[PDB]
């Protein structure tokens, strides 16, 4: 026959699909996902400092000293505040500028 030299490109067993502005479902040799999809279920501390965990209690009940709320925590510092669905105040009433207070104490 004749003597030959050819130009060619890589190919593999990769099955990864990507979309383009022109074509869709295009298979490529390698790709990188830039979307974070992970929900590990963990609740960590934030930038070195733990969150204040009120549980069933609420900021109002916590500060006032609601008998149905356990002080047990008493942390001098926190990053965020974690709770639960539904609060449970003993003596009925209202709290003025309550939301502003929750934001103030959020950290």
């Amino acid at each position: 026959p004749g003597d030959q030299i050819c130009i060619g490109y890589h190919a593999n067993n990769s099955t990864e699909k990507v979309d383009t502005i022109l074509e869709r479902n295009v298979t490529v040799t390698h790709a990188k996902d830039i979307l974070e999809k992970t929900h590990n279920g963990k609740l960590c501390k934030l930038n070195g400092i733990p969150p204040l965990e009120l549980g069933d209690c609420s900021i109002a009940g916590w500060l006032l000293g609601n008998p149905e709320c356990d002080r047990l925590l008493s942390v001098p510092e926190w990053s965020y505040i974690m709770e639960k669905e539904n609060p449970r105040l003993c003596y009925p009433g209202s709290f003025n500028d309550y939301e502003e207070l929750k934001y103030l104490l959020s950290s």
Partner: protein, 49 residues
Amino acid sequence: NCETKCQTPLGAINTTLPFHNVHPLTIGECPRYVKSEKLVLATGLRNVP
């Protein structure tokens, strides 16, 4: 016990990438929330047999 820069109700996240689709409610230095299910960049070339 763990450390994270971004915290969500469904968990923590690695913060390395620019986008996430985990949860809208978020606290920390966090990626941009998008409605996308997947954002895949092509690094290699087109795969042809």
